[PDB]
Amino acid sequence: GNAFAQSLSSNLLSSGDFVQMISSTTSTDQAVSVATSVAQNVGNQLGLDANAMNSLLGAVSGYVSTLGNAISDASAYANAISSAIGNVLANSGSISESTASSAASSAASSVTTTLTSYGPAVFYA
Protein backbone atom coordinates (compact mmCIF):
# COMPACT_ATOMS: atom_id res chain seq x y z
CA GLY A 1 0.00 0.00 0.00
CA ASN A 2 2.98 2.29 0.54
CA ALA A 3 3.62 2.27 -3.20
CA PHE A 4 0.18 3.74 -3.85
CA ALA A 5 0.78 6.75 -1.60
CA GLN A 6 4.44 6.93 -2.63
CA SER A 7 3.54 7.11 -6.32
CA LEU A 8 1.03 9.91 -5.78
CA SER A 9 3.09 11.74 -3.16
CA SER A 10 6.18 11.44 -5.36
CA ASN A 11 4.45 13.53 -8.02
CA LEU A 12 2.97 15.93 -5.46
CA LEU A 13 6.38 16.46 -3.86
CA SER A 14 8.03 17.19 -7.21
CA SER A 15 5.05 19.34 -8.21
CA GLY A 16 6.18 22.47 -10.02
CA ASP A 17 4.13 24.38 -7.46
CA PHE A 18 4.55 22.27 -4.33
CA VAL A 19 8.26 21.57 -4.84
CA GLN A 20 8.75 25.33 -5.16
CA MET A 21 7.60 25.86 -1.57
CA ILE A 22 9.53 22.85 -0.28
CA SER A 23 12.70 24.11 -1.95
CA SER A 24 11.95 27.74 -1.12
CA THR A 25 12.06 27.02 2.61
CA THR A 26 15.76 26.28 2.15
CA SER A 27 15.83 24.22 5.35
CA THR A 28 15.16 20.52 5.94
CA ASP A 29 13.94 21.45 9.42
CA GLN A 30 11.17 23.67 8.07
CA ALA A 31 10.49 21.15 5.30
CA VAL A 32 9.18 18.73 7.94
CA SER A 33 6.40 21.19 8.76
CA VAL A 34 5.07 21.01 5.20
CA ALA A 35 5.28 17.22 4.96
CA THR A 36 3.55 16.92 8.33
CA SER A 37 0.89 19.41 7.27
CA VAL A 38 -0.10 17.47 4.15
CA ALA A 39 0.01 14.18 6.04
CA GLN A 40 -2.42 15.53 8.64
CA ASN A 41 -5.05 16.06 5.94
CA VAL A 42 -4.75 12.47 4.73
CA GLY A 43 -4.79 11.02 8.23
CA ASN A 44 -7.65 13.29 9.28
CA GLN A 45 -9.89 11.66 6.67
CA LEU A 46 -9.17 8.31 8.31
CA GLY A 47 -9.58 9.63 11.84
CA LEU A 48 -7.19 7.75 14.12
CA ASP A 49 -6.45 8.76 17.71
CA ALA A 50 -5.22 12.29 18.41
CA ASN A 51 -2.36 11.11 20.63
CA ALA A 52 -1.48 8.23 18.31
CA MET A 53 -1.61 10.49 15.25
CA ASN A 54 1.14 12.62 16.79
CA SER A 55 3.49 9.64 17.07
CA LEU A 56 2.46 8.35 13.65
CA LEU A 57 3.10 11.68 11.92
CA GLY A 58 6.41 11.85 13.76
CA ALA A 59 7.66 8.91 11.71
CA VAL A 60 8.31 11.00 8.60
CA SER A 61 9.52 13.94 10.69
CA GLY A 62 12.44 11.81 11.83
CA TYR A 63 12.92 10.05 8.50
CA VAL A 64 13.28 13.29 6.55
CA SER A 65 15.94 14.49 8.99
CA THR A 66 18.17 11.75 7.59
CA LEU A 67 17.44 12.75 3.99
CA GLY A 68 17.35 16.52 4.45
CA ASN A 69 20.48 17.18 2.41
CA ALA A 70 18.83 15.65 -0.66
CA ILE A 71 15.15 16.60 -0.70
CA SER A 72 15.15 17.52 -4.39
CA ASP A 73 14.31 13.86 -4.99
CA ALA A 74 10.51 13.60 -4.82
CA SER A 75 10.79 9.81 -4.72
CA ALA A 76 13.20 9.90 -1.78
CA TYR A 77 11.43 12.72 0.06
CA ALA A 78 7.95 11.31 -0.57
CA ASN A 79 9.28 7.85 0.27
CA ALA A 80 9.44 8.79 3.95
CA ILE A 81 6.16 10.70 3.98
CA SER A 82 4.29 7.89 2.23
CA SER A 83 6.08 5.29 4.36
CA ALA A 84 5.06 7.10 7.55
CA ILE A 85 1.35 7.48 6.77
CA GLY A 86 1.28 4.26 4.77
CA ASN A 87 2.36 2.37 7.88
CA VAL A 88 -0.69 3.38 9.91
CA LEU A 89 -2.95 3.27 6.85
CA ALA A 90 -1.83 -0.25 5.95
CA ASN A 91 -2.51 -1.43 9.51
CA SER A 92 -6.14 -0.45 8.94
CA GLY A 93 -6.29 -2.82 5.99
CA SER A 94 -7.39 -1.29 2.69
CA ILE A 95 -7.14 2.45 2.06
CA SER A 96 -10.55 4.14 2.02
CA GLU A 97 -13.85 2.27 2.28
CA SER A 98 -12.89 0.20 -0.76
CA THR A 99 -10.93 2.17 -3.35
CA ALA A 100 -7.37 3.49 -3.62
CA SER A 101 -8.43 6.47 -5.73
CA SER A 102 -10.98 8.54 -3.80
CA ALA A 103 -8.77 8.75 -0.71
CA ALA A 104 -5.71 9.77 -2.72
CA SER A 105 -7.72 12.13 -4.92
CA SER A 106 -9.23 13.86 -1.89
CA ALA A 107 -6.04 13.84 0.18
CA ALA A 108 -3.98 15.14 -2.75
CA SER A 109 -6.72 17.63 -3.64
CA SER A 110 -6.48 19.24 -0.20
CA VAL A 111 -2.81 20.08 -0.74
CA THR A 112 -3.36 21.20 -4.34
CA THR A 113 -5.84 23.88 -3.25
CA THR A 114 -3.97 24.67 -0.04
CA LEU A 115 -1.08 26.25 -1.95
CA THR A 116 -2.35 27.87 -5.15
CA SER A 117 -6.00 28.53 -4.32
CA TYR A 118 -5.19 30.25 -1.03
CA GLY A 119 -1.53 30.90 -1.73
CA PRO A 120 1.90 29.53 -0.77
CA ALA A 121 2.46 31.74 2.27
CA VAL A 122 -0.87 30.40 3.54
CA PHE A 123 0.93 27.11 4.17
CA TYR A 124 3.21 28.64 6.81
CA ALA A 125 0.08 29.56 8.77
Side-chain angles (χ1 to χ4, degrees):
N2 166 40
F4 142 79
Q6 168 54 14
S7 273
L8 160 147
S9 297
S10 161
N11 221 69
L12 209 295
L13 266 305
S14 121
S15 275
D17 246 87
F18 203 55
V19 83
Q20 182 272 327
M21 218 187 62
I22 306 173
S23 287
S24 159
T25 192
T26 40
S27 264
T28 178
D29 219 66
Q30 268 43 275
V32 184
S33 250
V34 180
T36 47
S37 236
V38 294
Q40 176 178 117
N41 223 308
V42 188
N44 167 77
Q45 296 264 322
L46 237 91
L48 254 297
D49 273 284
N51 252 30
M53 261 268 108
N54 192 81
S55 202
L56 179 276
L57 237 307
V60 54
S61 172
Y63 273 40
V64 296
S65 208
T66 74
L67 63 121
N69 270 122
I71 319 181
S72 328
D73 267 307
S75 42
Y77 183 20
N79 250 130
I81 302 148
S82 64
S83 158
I85 45 128
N87 165 56
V88 56
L89 265 55
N91 214 40
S92 180
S94 290
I95 306 111
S96 222
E97 241 121 85
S98 39
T99 15
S101 59
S102 148
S105 188
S106 292
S109 154
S110 239
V111 178
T112 312
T113 179
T114 311
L115 174 79
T116 74
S117 96
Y118 269 40
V122 173
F123 226 88
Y124 310 144

